[PDB]
Design a protein around this ligand. Structure first.
Ligand SMILES: Nc1nc2c(ncn2[C@@H]2O[C@H](COP(=O)(O)OP(=O)(O)OP(=O)(O)O)[C@@H](O)[C@H]2O)c(=O)[nH]1
Ligand SMILES: O=C(O)C(=O)CS(=O)(=O)O
Ligand SMILES: [Mn+2]
Ligand SMILES: [Mn+2]
Ligand code: NA
Length: 613
C-alpha cells in the first residue's frame, strides 16, 4: 500500500464523481488543496443539466438565491454590500522582479498594476487559506476558455467553496466532464477560490452572502500558472476564468507565445450587399462594449452579430489573418441601463436560464433597475437589491450600479454562427474608445499601425475624473505595460500580416450644457458603416492632425437632422495641445524606461501635426 495511514486520500468526502477518474495532476491539485482548506465535502462537477438543477435547488433551499417566478429558470442573488464589484486594490500579481509585472513609476504610485513579492504573498496565503473551507463543499470545476478542443482554447480547474460560482462558471465557461476528457494529462491553469468564511462563522453573515472583505486578495502567480483568490464571491474576483485567467494570466502567455489577450468585444457586421466583416473593440468597463457587441443597427439592411462582448484572444494565422475567439461561454453584463432602446438583443437573451446579481425584484417576480425603461402596472411594487421596499423618489437606486446578469451566449438571438468556430474569425478593424465629454470627435482612423498602437496607449476615459485606461486594460495587464506596447508594435513585423485598420470612437461627447451630442446605441451603426467603407478603401476620409475623420456628408445622418455636426466633429488646437501635454506627463511618469521608441515618436508626430494648426 502507498501510505501508512490513509495518505492524502479524500475519497470518503466525495459526493459527486470520483477522484479515481481525474487525471493525476488534477487529483494532486484537488487533494493538496483539500488537505489545506479542509472542506466537509468534495463535489467534482460534471456540467450536466441534472447537476445544475440540483445545485440551484440547493442554493434556493439555503436562501442563497431566489427564483424569479416571472421568467423561465431565472434566479436572483443579493450580496453583502461590501462585496459588489471586482476590486482592483486587492488584486495583485506575484513575480520575482517587480519590473516584470509593472513599470516602476517615477511618482511612486503605479496606475498600471500592483505587484506583490513571493515572500509577502506566502505570508498572506498562510494567514487566509488553512482551514478556510471547513464545513463547506469544495467544488471542482473543470473548465475550458474557448471552444472545447480549439487550438486557441486553454483549460483550467477552479476549486471553490461557492455554489454561486459553480452556477455562474457553468454559464460563463464550458465546464464539466467533457473538459476533463479533453484535458487528459495536459497542462491546466490552477485556480483556487474561497469565500473565506469557514464554519462555524466567526463573523455575522450579511444577506446570506459569504465574504471576507478585510482579507480579500485576488492573486496571480503566472510563473506557477496559478490564480489564488480569497474573500470575495463577486464577478471578476471569483469567476476566475474571466479576468484572472483570460486577461491577466493569458496576456503574459500571449506575449511569450505570439498572440493577444484583450478586453475586447468581437462582432460581425454585414452590409446591405451581404459583405461581412468582423471587428474587435476595446472600451473600458462602463463604456458600452456590451451594447455595441449586440447592436440592433438602425440603418436598414445592416446586421450585427455577436461573437463575444468582453474578452478576445487573437492570433495571426498562416495566411496573415488576425483571428479572434471569444474564450467565454456567456455574457456577464451590467444590468442597469439595459432596455429595449439601449440593448434590445440583451433583453431577449436574459429571460431564461439567467442569474441576476444585485438587481431589484418586482412583486410579480420580475427584475428591475435604473434605465430599464419599462413602466410597471399601478400597484406593482419593487424590492431593492438591499431587500427593502423601494419607490422611484427614494434617494438611492433600486439596483446596485454594478449589478449584473449572467446569461448563456447561445441564447442570444444574434449570436454569430462562427462564435464557437475553433479557428476564430478574421478581424479587419480594431476600435478603441471611452468616455470623453470634450475635445475628442465621434470617430477617427489611425494613420498607421504604430499610430494605432499609440491611440490605444493614449486612451483616457471619464470615471471619477478623466483617467488613463490604455487599451481598456488598465486593471488587467498580466505584465509590464511597456513590454505590452512593444508586443503590440511587433505585430507590424510579422511577415504577410494583414494588419487591421485601427479606429477611435467617442460616443460621449457633450455640448456646453452637458447634453450628449450623439444619440448612440443603434445609431452607432452609422459610424460602423463609415469604418466598413474605410476598410474597403472608400475615399470617405478627411485628414486631420489626429488621424482621418469622415468627410462632410460621408456619414449617413438621415433621420438625425438635429445633430450639431460642427461641434461633434470639431478639433481644437488648444484642446489637443493640452492632450499631448498630459499624455507626455503620463507616459514619462508611469512607463518611463519601458516606453518603446515608436510610442515616443508617435507622440512627437501628433505634437508636430497639432503645431501646424
Ligand atoms: N451615450 C451613450 N451611452 C452609451 C452608449 N453605449 C453604451 N452606453 C452607456 O454605457 C453604459 C453601459 O456599458 P456597460 O455595459 O457598463 O459597459 P461594458 O463595456 O460592457 O462593461 P464591462 O462589462 O464591465 O466590461 C451605460 O451607461 C450606457 O448608457 C452610446 O452609444 N451612447
Ligand atoms: O469590470 C469589468 O470589465 C467586467 O467585465 C466585470 S468583472 O467580470 O470584472 O466583474
Ligand atoms: Mn459588458
Ligand atoms: Mn469587462
Ligand atoms: Na443574499
Amino acid at each position: 500500500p502507498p501510505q501508512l495511514h490513509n495518505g492524502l486520500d479524500f475519497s470518503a468526502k466525495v459526493i459527486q464523481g470520483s477522484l479515481d477518474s481525474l487525471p493525476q495532476e488534477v487529483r494532486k491539485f484537488v487533494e493538496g488543496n483539500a488537505q489545506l482548506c479542509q472542506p466537509e465535502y468534495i463535489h467534482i462537477c460534471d456540467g450536466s443539466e441534472e447537476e445544475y438543477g440540483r445545485l440551484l435547488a440547493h442554493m434556493q433551499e439555503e436562501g442563497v438565491i431566489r427564483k424569479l417566478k416571472k421568467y423561465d429558470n431565472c434566479w436572483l442573488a443579493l450580496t453583502d454590500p461590501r462585496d459588489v464589484a471586482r476590486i482592483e486594490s486587492k488584486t495583485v500579481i506575484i513575480t520575482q522582479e517587480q519590473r516584470d509585472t509593472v513599470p516602476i513609476p517615477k511618482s511612486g504610485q503605479s496606475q498600471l498594476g500592483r505587484w506583490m513579492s513571493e515572500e509577502d504573498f506566502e505570508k498572506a496565503f498562510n494567514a487566509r487559506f488553512p482551514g478556510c473551507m471547513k464545513g463547506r463543499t469544495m467544488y471542482v470545476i473543470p473548465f475550458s476558455m474557448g471552444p472545447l478542443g480549439s487550438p486557441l482554447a486553454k483549460i483550467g480547474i477552479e476549486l471553490t467553496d461557492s455554489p454561486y460560482v459553480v452556477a455562474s462558471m457553468r454559464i460563463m465557461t464550458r465546464m464539466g466532464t467533457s473538459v476533463l476528457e479533453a484535458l487528459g494529462d495536459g497542462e491546466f491553469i490552477k485556480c483556487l477560490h474561497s469565500v473565506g468564511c469557514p464554519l462555524p462563522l466567526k463573523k455575522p453573515l450579511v444577506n446570506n452572502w459569504a465574504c471576507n472583505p478585510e482579507l480579500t486578495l485576488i492573486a496571480h502567480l503566472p510563473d506557477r500558472r496559478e490564480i489564488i483568490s480569497f474573500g470575495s464571491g463577486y464577478g471578476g474576483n471569483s469567476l476566475l476564468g474571466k479576468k484572472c485567467f483570460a486577461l491577466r494570466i493569458a496576456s503574459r502567455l500571449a506575449k511569450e507565445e505570439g498572440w493577444l489577450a484583450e478586453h475586447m468585444l468581437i462582432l460581425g457586421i454585414t452590409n446591405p450587399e451581404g459583405k461581412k466583416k468582423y471587428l474587435a473593440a476595446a472600451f473600458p468597463s462602463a463604456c458600452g462594449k456590451t451594447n455595441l457587441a449586440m447592436m440592433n443597427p438602425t440603418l436598414p439592411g445592416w446586421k450585427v452579430e455577436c461573437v463575444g462582448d468582453d474578452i478576445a484572444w487573437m492570433k495571426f494565422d498562416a495566411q496573415g489573418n488576425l483571428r479572434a475567439i471569444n474564450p467565454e461561454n456567456g455574457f456577464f453584463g451590467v444590468a442597469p441601463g439595459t432596455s429595449v432602446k439601449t440593448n434590445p438583443n440583451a433583453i431577449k437573451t436574459i429571460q431564461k436560464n439567467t442569474i441576476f446579481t444585485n438587481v431589484a425584484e418586482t412583486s410579480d417576480g420580475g427584475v428591475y433597475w435604473e434605465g430599464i425603461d419599462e413602466p410597471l402596472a399601478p400597484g406593482v411594487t419593487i424590492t431593492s437589491w438591499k431587500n427593502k421596499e423601494w419607490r422611484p423618489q427614494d434617494e438611492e437606486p433600486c439596483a446596485h450600479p454594478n449589478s449584473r446578469f449572467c446569461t448563456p451566449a447561445s441564447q442570444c438571438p444574434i449570436i454569430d454562427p462562427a462564435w464557437e468556430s475553433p479557428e476564430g474569425v478574421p478581424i479587419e478593424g480594431i476600435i478603441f474608445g471611452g468616455r470623453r465629454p470634450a475635445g475628442v470627435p465621434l470617430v477617427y482612423e489611425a494613420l498607421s499601425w504604430q499610430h494605432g498602437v499609440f491611440v490605444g496607449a493614449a486612451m483616457r476615459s471619464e470615471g471619477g475624473g478623466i483617467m488613463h485606461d490604455p487599451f481598456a486594460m488598465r486593471p488587467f495587464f498580466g505584465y509590464n505595460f511597456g513590454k505590452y506596447l512593444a508586443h503590440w508594435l511587433s505585430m507590424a513585423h510579422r511577415p504577410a500580416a494583414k494588419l487591421p485598420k485601427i479606429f477611435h470612437v467617442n460616443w460621449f461627447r457633450k455640448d456646453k450644457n452637458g447634453k450628449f451630442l450623439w444619440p448612440g446605441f443603434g445609431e452607432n451603426s452609422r459610424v460602423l458603416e463609415w469604418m466598413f467603407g474605410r476598410i474597403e478603401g472608400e475615399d470617405s476620409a478627411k485628414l486631420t492632425p489626429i488621424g482621418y475623420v469622415p468627410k462632410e456628408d460621408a456619414l449617413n445622418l438621415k433621420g438625425l437632422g438635429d445633430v450639431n455636426v460642427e461641434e461633434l466633429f470639431g478639433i481644437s488646437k488648444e484642446f489637443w495641445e493640452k492632450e499631448v501635454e498630459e499624455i507626455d506627463k503620463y507616459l514619462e511618469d508611469q512607463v518611463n524606461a519601458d516606453l518603446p521608441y515608436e510610442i515616443e515618436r508617435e507622440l512627437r508626430a501628433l505634437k508636430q501635426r497639432i503645431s501646424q494648426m
